[PDB]
Amino acid sequence: RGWVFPNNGKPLRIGVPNRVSYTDYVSKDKNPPGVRGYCIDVFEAAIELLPYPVPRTYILYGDGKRNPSYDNLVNEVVADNFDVAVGDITIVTNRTRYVDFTQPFIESGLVVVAPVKEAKSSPWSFLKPFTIEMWAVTGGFFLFVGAMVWILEQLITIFWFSFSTMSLGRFVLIIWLFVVLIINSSYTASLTSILTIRQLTSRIEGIDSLVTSNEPIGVQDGTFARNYLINELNILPSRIVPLKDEEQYLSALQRGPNAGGVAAIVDELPYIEVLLTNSNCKFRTVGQEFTRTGWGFAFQRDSPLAVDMSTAILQLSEEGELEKIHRKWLNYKHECSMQISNSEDSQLSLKSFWGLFLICGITCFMALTVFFWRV
Amino acid sequence: RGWVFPNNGKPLRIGVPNRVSYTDYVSKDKNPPGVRGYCIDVFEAAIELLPYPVPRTYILYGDGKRNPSYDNLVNEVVADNFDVAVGDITIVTNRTRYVDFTQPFIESGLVVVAPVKEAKSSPWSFLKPFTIEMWAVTGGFFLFVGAMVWILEQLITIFWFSFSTMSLGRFVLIIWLFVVLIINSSYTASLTSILTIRQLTSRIEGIDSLVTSNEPIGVQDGTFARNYLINELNILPSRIVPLKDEEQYLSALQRGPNAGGVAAIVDELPYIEVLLTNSNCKFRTVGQEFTRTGWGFAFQRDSPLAVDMSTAILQLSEEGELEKIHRKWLNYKHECSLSLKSFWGLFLICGITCFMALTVFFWRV
Amino acid sequence: RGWVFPNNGKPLRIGVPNRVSYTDYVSKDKNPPGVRGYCIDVFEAAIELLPYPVPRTYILYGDGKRNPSYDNLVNEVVADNFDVAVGDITIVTNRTRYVDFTQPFIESGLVVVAPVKEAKSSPWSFLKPFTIEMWAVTGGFFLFVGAMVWILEQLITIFWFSFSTMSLGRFVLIIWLFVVLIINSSYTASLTSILTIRQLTSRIEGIDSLVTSNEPIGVQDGTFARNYLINELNILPSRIVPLKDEEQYLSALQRGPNAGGVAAIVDELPYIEVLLTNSNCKFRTVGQEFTRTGWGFAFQRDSPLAVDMSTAILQLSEEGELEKIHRKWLNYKHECSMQISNSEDSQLSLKSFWGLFLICGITCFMALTVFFWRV
Amino acid sequence: RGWVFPNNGKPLRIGVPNRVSYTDYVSKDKNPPGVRGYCIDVFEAAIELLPYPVPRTYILYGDGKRNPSYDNLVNEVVADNFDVAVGDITIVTNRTRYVDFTQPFIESGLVVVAPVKEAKSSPWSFLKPFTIEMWAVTGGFFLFVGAMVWILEQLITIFWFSFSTMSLGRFVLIIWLFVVLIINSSYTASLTSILTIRQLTSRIEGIDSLVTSNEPIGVQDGTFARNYLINELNILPSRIVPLKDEEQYLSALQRGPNAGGVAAIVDELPYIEVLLTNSNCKFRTVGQEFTRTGWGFAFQRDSPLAVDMSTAILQLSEEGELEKIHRKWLNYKHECSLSLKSFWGLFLICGITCFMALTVFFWRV
Ligand SMILES: *[C@@H]1O[C@H](CO)[C@@H](O[C@@H]2O[C@H](CO)[C@@H](O)[C@H](O)[C@H]2NC(C)=O)[C@H](O)[C@H]1NC(C)=O
Ligand SMILES: *[C@@H]1O[C@H](CO)[C@@H](O[C@@H]2O[C@H](CO)[C@@H](O)[C@H](O)[C@H]2NC(C)=O)[C@H](O)[C@H]1NC(C)=O
Ligand SMILES: *[C@@H]1O[C@H](CO)[C@@H](O[C@@H]2O[C@H](CO)[C@@H](O)[C@H](O)[C@H]2NC(C)=O)[C@H](O)[C@H]1NC(C)=O
Ligand SMILES: *[C@@H]1O[C@H](CO)[C@@H](O[C@@H]2O[C@H](CO)[C@@H](O)[C@H](O)[C@H]2NC(C)=O)[C@H](O)[C@H]1NC(C)=O
Ligand SMILES: N[C@@H](CCC(=O)O)C(=O)O
Ligand SMILES: N[C@@H](CCC(=O)O)C(=O)O
Numbered sequence A, C: 001r002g003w004v005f006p007n008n009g010k011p012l013r014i015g016v017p018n019r020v021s022y023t024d025y026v027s028k029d030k031n032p033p034g035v036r037g038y039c040i041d042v043f044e045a046a047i048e049l050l051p052y053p054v055p056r057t058y059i060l061y062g063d064g065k066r067n068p069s070y071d072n073l074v075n076e077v078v079a080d081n082f083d084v085a086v087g088d089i090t091i092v093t094n095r096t097r098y099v100d101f102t103q104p105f106i107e108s109g110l111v112v113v114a115p116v117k118e119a120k121s122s123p124w125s126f127l128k129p130f131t132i133e134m135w136a137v138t139g140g141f142f143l144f145v146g147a148m149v150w151i152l153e154q155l156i157t158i159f160w161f162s163f164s165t166m167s168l169g170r171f172v173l174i175i176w177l178f179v180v181l182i183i184n185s186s187y188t189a190s191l192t193s194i195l196t197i198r199q200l201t202s203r204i205e206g207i208d209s210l211v212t213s214n215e216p217i218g219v220q221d222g223t224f225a226r227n228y229l230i231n232e233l234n235i236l237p238s239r240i241v242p243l244k245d246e247e248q249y250l251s252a253l254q255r256g257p258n259a260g261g262v263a264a265i266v267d268e269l270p271y272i273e274v275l276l277t278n279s280n281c282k283f284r285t286v287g288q289e290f291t292r293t294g295w296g297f298a299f300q301r302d303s304p305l306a307v308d309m310s311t312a313i314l315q316l317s318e319e320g321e322l323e324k325i326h327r328k329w330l331n332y333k334h335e336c337s338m339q340i341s342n343s344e345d346s347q348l349s350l351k352s353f354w355g356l357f358l359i360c361g362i363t364c365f366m367a368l369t370v371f372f373w374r375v
Numbered sequence B, D: 001r002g003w004v005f006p007n008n009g010k011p012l013r014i015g016v017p018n019r020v021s022y023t024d025y026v027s028k029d030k031n032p033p034g035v036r037g038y039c040i041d042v043f044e045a046a047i048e049l050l051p052y053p054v055p056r057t058y059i060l061y062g063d064g065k066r067n068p069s070y071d072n073l074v075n076e077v078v079a080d081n082f083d084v085a086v087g088d089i090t091i092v093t094n095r096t097r098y099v100d101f102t103q104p105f106i107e108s109g110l111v112v113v114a115p116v117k118e119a120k121s122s123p124w125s126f127l128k129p130f131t132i133e134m135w136a137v138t139g140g141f142f143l144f145v146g147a148m149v150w151i152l153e154q155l156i157t158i159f160w161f162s163f164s165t166m167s168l169g170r171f172v173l174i175i176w177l178f179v180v181l182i183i184n185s186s187y188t189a190s191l192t193s194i195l196t197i198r199q200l201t202s203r204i205e206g207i208d209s210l211v212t213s214n215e216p217i218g219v220q221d222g223t224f225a226r227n228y229l230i231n232e233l234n235i236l237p238s239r240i241v242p243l244k245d246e247e248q249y250l251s252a253l254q255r256g257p258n259a260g261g262v263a264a265i266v267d268e269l270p271y272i273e274v275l276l277t278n279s280n281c282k283f284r285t286v287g288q289e290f291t292r293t294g295w296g297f298a299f300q301r302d303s304p305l306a307v308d309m310s311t312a313i314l315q316l317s318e319e320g321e322l323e324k325i326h327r328k329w330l331n332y333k334h335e336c337s338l339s340l341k342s343f344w345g346l347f348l349i350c351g352i353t354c355f356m357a358l359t360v361f362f363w364r365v
């Protein structure tokens, strides 16, 4: 093959982004190579597939405070300050136009990570729709009416239950009938209004729910997704909030959309699978990937090293060592199937009726103990 | 550029408001600048964006006891006692008529602050479904169908109450039971559709809910929103109550509308974010910005020093420095923030009917 | 007073907007003055209050196809192509900065005009929540059960109504009880679900409801309100739809938010009071004015004719002739109080119970005719 | 500008797709240009914005029977049989890898079209509140409390059904009646919260609702969305069904998924607006644009003629001419577009229990 990479004093200026969060893909290091992460060693393993002994260098790009803007990093490959950008560079439609990429060594897609549904189930959830002061007064003004039925008339007390089945005490019964009819509808409304607002809360089941909800959306700093959601999804820039690091990415969702926080974070798929292992079982990609392109190495435009390394990636992809390096660093995977595309429907709490029928079980057994007490 | 600011024996007469409350934006200071606050430091950096060395002074305007009228402070720039007014001057139309502002360096809006309150009404809120004409139609036809019991028969009325509880007259029981079964669902469906939307209406408020309610309205001392609601919203001046400092903004709302206090203070947006940070979240912005203009610096009219200081604000804002100045002083976002049932109306009917029966038992005994 | 307007060959270049819709304020005309409308004669009446015999001209600005952009018209006063703009120029905060205005001869405010609530009231509204095929089958499977009660057992037919008040036919009654219990809840839900969606439809009760509803909003062509709702209210430009003329302004609201239409039109107050007289009783300003500034005449910046005509307006405002000219053209006023800030609450249809109790009145009278038939 | 397009004996080889369906964007023509459609007239005006006289020709690419693969049409620009491809070429990544596009002159997205359909399910939708474990808990404890009737007493079970309808055992009637009264409201509140949100969920659809449902998917002939869903969305190719023309887009959805037809055609946004204008509103876009890129013109890679033709699109669009060209061809917005009850499940139970009683009456008679 006619190209020979020259043997001269200019090295290969690998541009390295200076990542603050997600130091497992690419990061600053104290070692004699100088850089650490995943795509570094991916780029390292691509060297031995080529017959070129390649001298090179590693230049960190951003600061040590926040993530570097890759569109500025791509421009520094356009401006020929660098020879090649190696990192988490996502193939975006401008970026394809201005520089040259390889084949995607890995795939990726923009996801929506969001807090999961925490739905309660208790005997408290059964007795929920009235106040604790209301459940005593309503039962209190049954016996308060029933004590007046005595004036119209434990073993002595059971006789009035026979007469309260179906003069002046009949007029007491008529108004007491209108009591129960409203408390029928009052419990009906107050349980409906809880089962409605629980369904009609601030929810998202995809990017389309997240666009039209006019809520603040979190992103990371220096990514395409800020200028992607503006230029494509028709989102106001005041919704889109950049965020610096993974310790901030949680507490912006621990606060939820309020306390200054955002509704949800839109990031790429392989960042979030690290984040799920980094977090507890509280979050999930609520939809599918809505922009699925992948990564790649940014080269100089019309570089002869492209088709060399484009073949080397596809060769190494067939050899399975790409997945073996993907086992060395990116072994962090856990499902914790909290919710799995759960249909929001009727779904009445199974423990809410663990509080009804077991108190009914107490009553039937207390009926049976007094039954044996006669025996 | 043709204009160069000359360096003669006269300095630049910056008008500074003698600010009493909210001393984070601007304040009297014992430093050798003599000034302290946000809009000072906003002004200082745009000086450093000029190609000019700018000799300048700072003069406090009003009395130290109360906040002065900024329109009179604007008027001194018209009266040429100052070269430029720097402070919390908010862009109003007749303020723009006489002096020339800069671009807005911050965004401010008129909001209404008011205490948070309960949502549940009286015993009559229990009765609120079924508009009250149709209760008399209900109870009227309730007894009118019960009059058909007495056809199909003090001693006769008890027999009319005997078959009322539980032939052709028992076919009348068939049709009426079908009716009141619907009325049971009709009162149910009306009650549900009230208690559902009242958990979704966060908009049950408004500036008009204050205008129509002829309540005492608190205002801060020396502001445009005093004269703004009078000329535009036509609100009576007896409703408008001035306030001099920050702690009086609380106690006039601690007392509520009664005890001499005010119901809802109409102040600007960036002031309320300071004060709600200072307190607990017992006080709420009942709506949104009903008049949103923003602040600005007021040079004397047709002065070329306004022009480059306008563009210097644009260059400094797009750089991202005003926000860094903002976090230096106002990084203050410390803001906190199901369904149940409580009423008393039907249990009064539990009290009326039951003690009535004791008298008849006392009249029998 | 030291100023004297000169007696020379240059006339007074009055800039006149070429209005397509609302030709009652200012319009092209075939007359020797050349222009027609309201603010023309307002400007005409301001001349005789000044002691200056003023020669002048009238220049139409826009085309005959759509309304001219007044910010371009104000710029043509800045660019000194014109001496004065006379028309519907609203005092906006840039416009105060770049030119000089008079005092407002009239006041105005941005309103929200919107379709009114049409709520139905009928005996059909009573029998609404089931299908017409359902109201016959449900009543059909009462007598279908009741015909089996005959096998357990008009003047002969009335006997089973006595036995259906409260063996194997008792087992028929138990399942028939479970029929009515569900149809109780089935009518309860289907009437709730109609009374809920009627409340939770696409509604607006102010500008704040109209901002957060992310709906298309109509405006007129060449106004500040397009660049006002963007720069202040934080509204996406794809919602804001300009519209050319008053025959289009109706059919964009006759279609509602769908069929390509918009949700509501935001215009100034004096345009909409013409539009209400121009329309039937179908629309109303649903809120108060949320941006209330008024009109004025745009002058050259630092013109001596300002304080002359600023005094002349305030003089004529005190004389009441300003309202008399406001009677010559702007006499079009009608209320037609369809809805007047109506509280959306319980409000159960009075004619829905005109269908219940009158059929109950038929039944009670048919009971009384057979009562007299025995007599 | 350094480059000038030379005027030698060779013209500009515009690749034109031999377009069969949707002949409003581009079509074979008998005119002396030989071309007719939208993207032609979009191309012609940006020629007139150049400082150049541009000699040019037009060649139809594919067969007139079917729509050709545009990727092969893109490949001929790579194969240098054409100088530039002009048509409905949509910007894809590997399409951008080999040739150089212009800026997008129109905005297109992938949508899914499908017929409108009913929302009500079977007799089991009547039973859908109360998850089916809790019906057996209901009916199990319904008869278990009815077993306490028989303690407090074929002839004995009828007496157990006698007191079941309407002492210490009558105190058991007190507590159980309180329970089933709640269950009446619990089934009511569960049914209401289903029939309320199902009038608010317009989002009960999706591309994933087609992916998981392993349905036949119709595609147009010679498109990227054929190969797009295969490589990206991993959908099996047996689901994918090609279609050659416009009338076959209807009849494969007239037949539905069965009778050999397809369930939902995935085509681009500006095609669907043509076709839904052509038909009645029986066919719906089930969601939004799940892949939105836009069209473009494809010059040969690293040709300077792409650069000025890119900026000419920007100058012509901001002038407002592309929309006037758009109304000349596609001014087509002709698009049309309460709650009730219908089910059959409980009336089958009306059929089961009643005809069972005729047998016992026949067994008695
Ligand atoms: C499209 O991508 C490019 C590069 O990221 C941007 O276009 C120009 O790129 C050059 C680099 O040679 C810069 O000098 C220009 O300033 C860029 N122009 C603009 C307007 O930014 C451009 O930012 C991207 N476009 C979008 C919409 O994100
Ligand atoms: C709008 O602002 C102007 C400018 O201050 C006000 O006009 C001044 O009013 C004071 C009141 O005593 C007087 O000095 C003059 O009448 C004006 N001063 C000038 C012209 O220098 C005007 O009153 C304000 N409008 C309203 C409604 O208050
Ligand atoms: C504010 O109003 C002015 C006047 O219409 C606009 O500012 C500039 O006005 C000059 C007139 O000499 C024009 O030549 C400039 O093009 C205008 N600037 C811009 C950026 O267009 C200005 O547009 C208005 N502000 C807004 C937000 O619309
Ligand atoms: C993306 O486009 C390229 C360019 O056409 C495709 O590569 C070609 O594939 C055809 C298949 O027969 C062959 O001619 C060559 O392998 C390629 N031609 C070239 C490089 O000129 C590529 O296959 C497309 N991607 C996918 C996933 O189909
Ligand atoms: N995938 C993103 C990452 C940006 C970042 O890490 O800051 C990109 O390539 O633009
Ligand atoms: N923005 C107000 C502030 C008034 C005050 O702080 O007293 C004004 O300029 O009038």
Ligand SMILES: N[C@@H](CCC(=O)O)C(=O)O
Binding pocket: C067, C068, C069, C070, C088, C089, C090, C091, C220, C221, C222, C223, C224, C225, C268
């Ligand atoms: N009041 C609007 C009217 C605009 C118009 O009529 O086009 C303005 O002055 O800008």
Ligand SMILES: N[C@@H](CCC(=O)O)C(=O)O
Binding pocket: D067, D068, D070, D071, D088, D089, D090, D220, D221, D222, D223, D224, D225, D268
């Ligand atoms: N936008 C599609 C159109 C395909 C077609 O019309 O057949 C493409 O470029 O592939």
